[PDB]
Amino acid sequence: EKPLEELYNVRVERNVTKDRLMELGVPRWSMWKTGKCKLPWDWHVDQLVYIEEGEVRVVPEGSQRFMQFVAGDLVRYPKWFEADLYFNDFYQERYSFRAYGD
Amino acid sequence: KFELMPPPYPMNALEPHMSHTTFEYHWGKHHRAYVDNLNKQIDGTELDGMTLEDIILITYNRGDLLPPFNNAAQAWNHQFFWESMKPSGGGKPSGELLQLINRDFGSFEAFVKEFKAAAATQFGSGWAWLAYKANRLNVGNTSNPHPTDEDKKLVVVKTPNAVNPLVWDYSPLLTIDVWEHAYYLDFRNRRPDYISIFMEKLVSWEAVSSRLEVAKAKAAEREEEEERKKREKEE
Amino acid sequence: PDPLQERDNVQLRIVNYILYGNGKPIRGISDTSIQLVRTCLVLNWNQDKKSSSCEEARASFVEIRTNGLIRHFLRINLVKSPISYIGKRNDPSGSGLLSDNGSDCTNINPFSSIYSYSKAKIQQSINQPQGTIHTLLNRNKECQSLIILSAANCSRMGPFKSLGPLGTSLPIENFYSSYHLITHNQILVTNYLQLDNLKQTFQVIKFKYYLMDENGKIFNPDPCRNIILNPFNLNWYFLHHNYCEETSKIISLGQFICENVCIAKNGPPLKSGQVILVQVDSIVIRSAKPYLATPGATVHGHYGETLYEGDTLVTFIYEK
Amino acid sequence: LQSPGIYYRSELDHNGISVYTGTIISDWGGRSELEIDRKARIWARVSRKQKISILVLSSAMGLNLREILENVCYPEIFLSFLFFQQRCELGRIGRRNMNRRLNLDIPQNNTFLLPRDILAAADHLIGLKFGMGALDDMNHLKNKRIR
Amino acid sequence: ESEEEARRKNWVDRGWAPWEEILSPEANFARKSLNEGEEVALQSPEAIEAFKMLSPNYRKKKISDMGITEDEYYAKQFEIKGEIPEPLSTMWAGPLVVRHVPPRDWPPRGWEVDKKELEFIRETHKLQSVRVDYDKVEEMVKMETDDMGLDRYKMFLKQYNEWVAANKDRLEKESYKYDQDYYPGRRKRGKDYQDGMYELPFYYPGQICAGKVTAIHLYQGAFVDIGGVHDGWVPIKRNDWYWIRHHIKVGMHVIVEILAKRDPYRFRFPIEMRFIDPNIDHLIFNRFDFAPIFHRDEDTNLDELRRDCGRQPLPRKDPGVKVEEEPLLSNHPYVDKLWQIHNAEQMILDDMEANPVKYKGKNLTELTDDEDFDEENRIEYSKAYYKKALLPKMITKVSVKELDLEAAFAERQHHNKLRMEAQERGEVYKIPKLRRNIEMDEYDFIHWRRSLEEREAMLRDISCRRALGLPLEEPGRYVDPSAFGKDQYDPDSPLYRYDYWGEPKNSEKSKQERMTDVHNKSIVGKGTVWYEMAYEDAVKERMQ
Amino acid sequence: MHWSTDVYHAPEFTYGNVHLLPKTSHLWILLGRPCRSSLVYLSIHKDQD
Amino acid sequence: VFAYYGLKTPPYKLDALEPYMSQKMLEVHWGEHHRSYVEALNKQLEKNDILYGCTMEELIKVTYNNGNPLPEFSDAAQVWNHDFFWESMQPGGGDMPKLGLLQQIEKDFGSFTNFREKFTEAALALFGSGWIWLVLKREEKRLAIVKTSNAVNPLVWNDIPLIGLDLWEHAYYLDYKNDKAKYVNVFMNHLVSWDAALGRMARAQAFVNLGEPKIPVA
């Protein structure tokens, strides 16, 4: 019922504004890229991700259900979060690892 | 027996904006309590006789903060903070810095508005920082393949209570005291108003340039030591 | 050789040893020349100083197939003695009995979910017991155990034959008063407060209800009297405080009833047990079976012990 | 023939309270005896001599006195109290029987008189003295094997 | 232990309570008689009466003497022995002042109503900060009516009325599907559903309400009717009921206060409450830690479930390592496809390049490995080949479309020309890297930065948390290894393993012996090792 | 197991499960299915679920 | 738009506790910091409906997220804490706990002085801005002295707070800019309400029962 995101606390902003992104140094973030691959990652600190081209399906460990991300979104994955990240096509990604505080 | 430094600037009658009374409380009272306590604790200490930087590093003690870290960090923090202030000198620092700023923040103004945000980030006692990226990776695949320039970065961090980037080895340049004792008197909880003033009316931009120079020098020394290590490995 | 490589457990080493023993020359064949020095490569897992480690390594052929052309690179992989990943990041990518099988949710691709749908379709196991979990309070200090209760165990013995939210309390100007607890406790009042108003009738007061409007004025139709406002209607009605209750309980909760006893001359509760649910026209009983022990015997068990079938309950001593 | 395993017998005692005993049949045929008297004895009866210490055998295994205490229930009673070639091999049949009688779950490939077992045996031996136990019937066919 | 102490332990710990036993005319005889002895004249007075009552006539005659109807005898059998507690008297503290505040979470998730109205509704939430004084209340009381405007509440009331209309039906259908049989606390339906029964958005915590007890359960608690589709639960359990029964009975009229509202699907008893009118707090010693839930048919992930309920994390064994210091990870997922692809492209290109017949009739831009090939179909494991040994042989299909053949062919030419000049040189051509090889490092490169960025941050967090007095690892994910106990141990510390005394341990299991057998074949002479080297060291020696 | 009355509350000897009886009593065995639980289970299997 | 909103005046007059505390210190604390705290929350709340509808207790607890506070944690925690602080102080001070709390204090922590000593000492230690509290622990059924850095209240770990003090600098600076010991000593000796605590114990007794069951003899 509740979307999976709320349960797992991955807060997202959809279709982020250019002005908003003007703030927060969205530009100059480190970049990542992939084609078709699956990654198992456990985040030990929070990540702020501005995906752009990349599309990712996150299946929380054990789930038979997934969270799908497309276009321009900014997702803050939680500390201690463990999930599997699966992508079938081109990926772009900007990443800042925000520790406590910002 | 660490230095109870008399304040570097005239201090008392130095600035109209900062009260002499406020100064008396900040330096006269806090330092004195810190230093005697630091001294008291360091009585019979093998640690005694080390540098302040050494004692701070030592008692932070990595994962577990040990008993003496708090006192020392603050003593050092207070005087380092002191260095940043100027008798009415501020604005548009230029030199290596201006070149560095546009490289990162993109404008001196941009850095200023970015630094201004720190007022919000502390949420309590602490110190905001401007720092250098001479950072030692301590484990595993520590070395950087394709090692290249721009590795250097001018970084701004937020530290709660007793924290100095030395603990994580980022070279500190400038500091502000967000701990209420420092600004409460002149403005009662108006941290936004106090901040910009510090940013413009009283910060020795040149002291920060000197510090930047010192940091560049230290980084160079470190790379030289690395080259020495490489030579030893070759031989 | 690659610029970026990551530390790995496997330790490849090469051992070159002399062919023959020193001081003894073997005969040399005219056709084939002797090999003075030889070399070999060995694969040994890295071993911790504290615990010796023996390599567990197997090689299986793998092929890259393109237009029926085979790349004969058989990878050799080392299976770690530790069963599982410390962390998902460090995890082996594949952890399944069969790579081909798509039954596992992890095995099903995120991109194509057909295998996952098939797994979802399969029904849950019927092995489980379908009931309320009853936890043993007795075993709480020790390892706890569970009893699962169901219909087989509990049965409905007897077929047999104005109200709502009054409001929310308003915060208090005189905090020091003990008025904040809405009602007092007859036994525990003494510790909080000396009983000055105990002498007064209806304690401090009987029910006294006053409704406050959004504006701030208190409107009660009769201040001394108790009247209430029902929310939906918005009219005013009394609460039947007296309640008109005249109920006598023939069977009370927790009583144990033996067989062949009659509550009335109808419907004998033919089941021993403890009443566990009393409702208006029914009672539910959990089954029990009685056992008699004469003085001089032994009961093997503590009060809330779980006895499985076949376990001795009592021992009697008889004189032949 | 009798199967390898641990068997508990209660020998009625000539004086006062009855003695209890355990025994370990093996493929070799060596039998291992442990006994508890009215005063807790936990004494091996393998030696013709009356007293041999089961605890000493546990110490021979390198177990700490402290380690033993943590492992055994009924610690106080044992506190108050303060080969390999033949007997120590138990066949697969021998191991399974041991695991069933004294609940243990050492895996089947293991086929040895590992020390934990000896401790468990002592623990059961005292439980009988307090009433919590079963004395075995050796004529039952669960205890016999066919060649 | 004295009996007095033991009786305590059994009550507090193991649940003992001396409940009543209703027995047959014959069982009573049994309990009283056996005390005396065997085959002996019964002397105790109680026994003699028990003998006489095994006869039906004596019982009826005796009851008539007691002057009660037949029904009365039956009732006295079910009576409560022991001390009978005094009745409990209600003491009210001070007056009650209340306002009908609209439920805070009015919107049921998913119903949209006009915003301005909502804003109006939520104004009231602000008004509760005011403080009024009880003593002067009497004076302000206007017995008069018609001057009260609960406009905000009234607006909410209209709003709700619409809501009920829309989903009454949906709500009954949903219950039937997910709840088979009614138990107290679940939606009333059918003959049960009289209209006017309040629904769930109406109730919010903190409300004071009026009700009647409809049920008592020994292992769960009292159930009260508050005028709504769902009943309310006051939690009382087990031994406590021994005394509480004398004070809470079915059909009593009680006053209660809501302390929680929860979802019907996950939580068994939706509304939790406490008794206000009869204060029974002295008596409730045993309590529920977490509220009861339904483990429904659909859920497969325990972890997802823990989150919806509120329960602590499932435990895992604690890991010895501190990840404050651990090696960085420098490998890339997409790399797998590439090493598989760079070779794949080259292998197809090489086949055409090496053979003139293959080259003829072949177009670099477009080629097909097979007309019907499917990569998914190709994946397989085959043990048939026994050339070196019989073992699985995987097959991976490279989509012809995927391969960048034309680019490879162009690259190969430059490479073969280089090879041809090398042939003129007479020195075998060696190529250190190909662009594809360079790419491998490039895709790989981003990862080094990933670890770094994180690790650095982590360092920053460790310290931030360590000074802020916050939690380092999940509260509850990791538990002491020792606490889980009695697991079989490979080590000899729990003695699970066997150390050796007077022991051959002839069961090497060919752990080294089988390996030695293979060694002997390779190296029949037991030669001293003239040279030993690591592969990496050897590569370094070749480079330098 | 349940005994309302007539069984000595105190275990007979220091370390065992034997309780003796002063006068004649009935011991009741109440019926339910006994299942066994891991520490893992105990966290998500709670009372009255 | 706002719930858990509103500024609730302190129960006492703003300048009522004059000898011990200046009107100034009180006026500023309620007037500026507290008011700011409330307003902030309200706006933060407007955005998400789901968190609008939560018990205060629940809101503080939901937001903590087992150690990763969500963005809204601070405002709520601080408003609740400040409101609590106001119930703790009174138009007077307490020589000692009366009635039941005395029996408890004696049992769990020595004698009243013995307790004070632990209390004063613990108080000295906190480094930075934090609050100190006296609480009841549900599971172990004993009173305890607990110290939390920054915002965190003792509600987050399911304990029931009886009294609480603000060790944040703004609270004690105006009068004694650097006399820490003074604010502490005065409060305990002269500016705390024992009565309020006893009253709070009373509601607590519904949730945790301290006492012994009547065990029937049979």
Automatic annotation (TrEMBL), chain A:
Domain (S)-ureidoglycine aminohydrolase cupin: 23-94
Highest taxon listed in the record's lineage: Eukaryota
Coiled coil: none
Name recorded for this polypeptide: (S)-ureidoglycine aminohydrolase cupin domain-containing protein
Annotated organism of origin: Nicotiana tabacum (Common tobacco)
Lineage: Eukaryota, Viridiplantae, Streptophyta, Embryophyta, Tracheophyta
Residues of the full protein shown: 41 to 142 of 143
TrEMBL record, chain B:
Biased composition (Basic and acidic residues): 218-235
Bilayer-crossing regions: none
Biological process annotations from GO: response to light stimulus
Catalytic activity: 2 superoxide + 2 H(+) = H2O2 + O2
Residue ranges of every copy of the Manganese/iron superoxide dismutase C-terminal domain listed in the record: 93-145, 149-211
Keywords: Chloroplast, Iron, Metal-binding, Oxidoreductase, Plastid
Residue ranges constituting the Manganese/iron superoxide dismutase N-terminal domain according to the UniProt record: 1-85
Cofactor(s) the protein requires to work: Fe cation
Signal peptide region: none
Amino-acid positions noted as binding Fe(3+) in the UniProt annotation, renumbered to this chain: H26, H78, D177, H181
EC number, UniProt record: 1.15.1.1
Compartments where found: Plastid, Chloroplast
MF terms (GO), sorted A to Z: metal ion binding; superoxide dismutase activity
One of the record's GO cellular component terms: chloroplast nucleoid
Domain of life: Eukaryota
Enzyme class, first EC level, given as a word: oxidoreductase
Family: Belongs to the iron/manganese superoxide dismutase family.
Protein name: superoxide dismutase
Organism this protein belongs to: Nicotiana tabacum (Common tobacco)
Source species taxonomy: Eukaryota, Viridiplantae, Streptophyta, Embryophyta, Tracheophyta
Entire-sequence positions represented here: 48 to 282 of 303
From TrEMBL, chain E:
Occurrences of domain S1 motif (ranges): 206-274
Domain of life: Eukaryota
Gene Ontology CC entries for this record: plastid-encoded plastid RNA polymerase complex
The protein's name in its UniProt record: Protein PLASTID TRANSCRIPTIONALLY ACTIVE 10
One term of GO molecular function: RNA binding
Part of the whole protein covered: 72 to 615 of 682
From TrEMBL, chain G:
Domain Manganese/iron superoxide dismutase C-terminal: 100-197
Enzyme Commission number, as recorded: 1.15.1.1
Domain Manganese/iron superoxide dismutase N-terminal: 5-89
Sites where the protein binds Fe(3+): H29, H82, D166, H170
Transmembrane regions: none
Enzyme class: oxidoreductase
Protein localization: Plastid, Chloroplast
Cofactor(s) of this protein: Fe cation
Entry GO terms, CC: chloroplast
Cleaved signal peptide residues: none
GO molecular function: metal ion binding; superoxide dismutase activity
Predominant localisation class: plastid
Keywords carried by this UniProt record: Chloroplast, Metal-binding, Oxidoreductase, Plastid
Residue ranges of coiled coil: none
Family to which this protein belongs: Belongs to the iron/manganese superoxide dismutase family.
Protein name: superoxide dismutase
Organism per entry: Nicotiana tabacum (Common tobacco)
Gene: LOC107820063
Full protein: residues contained: 49 to 266 of 266
